[PDB]
Symmetry: C3
Subunit: 90 residues, 3 copies
Amino acid sequence: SSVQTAATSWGTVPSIRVYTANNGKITERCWDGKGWYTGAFNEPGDNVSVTSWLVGSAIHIRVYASTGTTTTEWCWDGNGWTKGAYTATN
Amino acid sequence: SSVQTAATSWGTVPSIRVYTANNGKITERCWDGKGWYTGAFNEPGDNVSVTSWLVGSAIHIRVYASTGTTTTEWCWDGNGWTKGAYTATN
Amino acid sequence: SSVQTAATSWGTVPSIRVYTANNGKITERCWDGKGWYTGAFNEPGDNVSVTSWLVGSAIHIRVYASTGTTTTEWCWDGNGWTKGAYTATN
Ligand SMILES: O=S(=O)(O)c1cc2c(O)c(c1)Cc1cc(S(=O)(=O)O)cc(c1O)Cc1cc(S(=O)(=O)O)cc(c1O)Cc1cc(S(=O)(=O)O)cc(c1O)C2
Ligand SMILES: O=S(=O)(O)c1cc2c(O)c(c1)Cc1cc(S(=O)(=O)O)cc(c1O)Cc1cc(S(=O)(=O)O)cc(c1O)Cc1cc(S(=O)(=O)O)cc(c1O)C2
Ligand SMILES: O=S(=O)(O)c1cc2c(O)c(c1)Cc1cc(S(=O)(=O)O)cc(c1O)Cc1cc(S(=O)(=O)O)cc(c1O)Cc1cc(S(=O)(=O)O)cc(c1O)C2
Ligand SMILES: O=S(=O)(O)c1cc2c(O)c(c1)Cc1cc(S(=O)(=O)O)cc(c1O)Cc1cc(S(=O)(=O)O)cc(c1O)Cc1cc(S(=O)(=O)O)cc(c1O)C2
Ligand SMILES: O=S(=O)(O)c1cc2c(O)c(c1)Cc1cc(S(=O)(=O)O)cc(c1O)Cc1cc(S(=O)(=O)O)cc(c1O)Cc1cc(S(=O)(=O)O)cc(c1O)C2
Ligand SMILES: O=S(=O)(O)c1cc2c(O)c(c1)Cc1cc(S(=O)(=O)O)cc(c1O)Cc1cc(S(=O)(=O)O)cc(c1O)Cc1cc(S(=O)(=O)O)cc(c1O)C2
């Protein structure tokens, strides 16, 4: 099956995160200037989007993972991934 | 199919906009720091992408809504959604 | 079937790049404030995502083009599109 990706980046440095949806799972590949590695993010979804923003030098990431009509938001705010408040009535 | 999303964010609060394509309909959910609400954007499209940029504190959003080989650009520039000049020969 | 797009933008003009996956080919439309034109980017893919960042006034673009389970990264750093180091085990 044909993977679907989403990407975000930050910093003059920079850092890149690439999310791939495949077989109902979204996984994460990371670049911080020194090679690609597998990130901590591992959550269910058939579809993925992402956005991120800096507050000073602190990154905040939001990943929108969708299966069927249900989209779940995942939040990185410096200390692990947690489910966000996002809802929609799809 | 699953729903398909696209996300953008700006500032440090931040503001977030999440666009969802659901069986050919695109809708918008918005966060400005207190809670999610349904945004004004509601247009047809089977696929969606988005980008945004600030000019000072003024946000500009471009949503690319695709049905078949026709992509329609939708523009937010402070005063409602308008069709943009984007064309492609798909 | 519908085409699938990805978009990025930078600066305050702004510059915008829209990537469209259509029948296994990804092409690029560009805006730099003065009309849409067809960009140099032409690579295979059924799925596309993009991110970009500025270093001063120099843009850096990364396009993730997927065919089946294989994602290829393409890099713009001011001298044409080049192969990126991205890998994944999908
Ligand atoms: O990688 S290929 O593009 O050459 C390829 C295409 C198809 C294939 O069946 C395979 C490879 C073999 C294959 C690969 C994988 S995967 O490496 O994990 O992606 C999985 C499977 C498989 O037969 C099993 C499978 C899973 C799913 S899933 O429910 O989405 O996870 C769907 C399918 C599967 O065969 C159906 C399917 C979808 C697609 S599509 O490209 O997504 O439309 C192509 C092919 C398919 O068989 C047609
Ligand atoms: O993709 S690359 O081939 O360019 C690459 C090569 C090396 C790298 O260190 C990395 C990428 C970054 C990297 C990625 C990963 S991943 O998450 O699995 O993708 C993991 C690591 C890492 O540095 C951490 C790591 C783990 C282990 S383990 O304890 O055995 O699991 C060993 C190593 C690690 O760096 C050593 C290592 C092995 C290898 S090898 O492929 O096994 O020869 C290459 C490189 C190495 O630094 C040299
Ligand atoms: O839910 S299933 O995994 O069993 C499933 C997978 C595929 C299917 O084609 C169907 C079911 C049948 C089917 C279901 C629906 S739905 O009930 O509304 O979900 C819709 C369709 C369909 O053929 C028609 C359709 C719509 C769209 S959409 O307009 O973008 O929503 C896309 C597709 C459709 O076939 C393409 C498609 C996407 C996907 S994906 O998992 O979302 O990438 C899987 C399958 C697809 O045929 C492959
Ligand atoms: O690839 S997509 O994810 O966009 C997709 C969306 C839909 C789908 O039903 C399919 C794929 C499956 C599918 C694929 C193809 S193929 O790429 O050519 O193999 C063809 C069809 C189909 O259902 C048949 C078909 C053709 C056409 S037309 O040639 O443009 O007239 C229209 C439709 C078809 O089902 C109706 C249709 C339109 C649209 S759209 O919103 O108008 O783009 C989305 C989906 C549709 O099923 C919903
Ligand atoms: O060459 S020009 O000085 O006439 C020029 C200035 C600007 C422009 O937007 C363009 C040309 C159009 C243009 C062309 C191309 S090309 O097809 O490859 O020739 C590429 C771009 C572009 O905007 C994309 C682009 C590239 C780069 S760079 O590759 O890192 O040099 C920087 C920028 C781009 O938009 C940002 C930028 C900086 C500057 S600055 O004067 O350096 O601050 C002026 C203009 C800019 O668009 C403002
Ligand atoms: O245009 S083509 O797709 O036909 C093409 C094929 C090959 C080529 O060598 C090139 C183009 C030229 C070329 C382009 C670039 S780019 O500017 O970055 O796009 C880079 C290179 C290059 O030869 C250098 C290079 C990179 C790598 S990488 O490690 O995978 O990034 C591998 C090679 C390179 O020469 C060896 C190589 C691999 C492959 S393969 O497709 O990976 O099997 C094809 C060709 C190769 O020369 C054979």
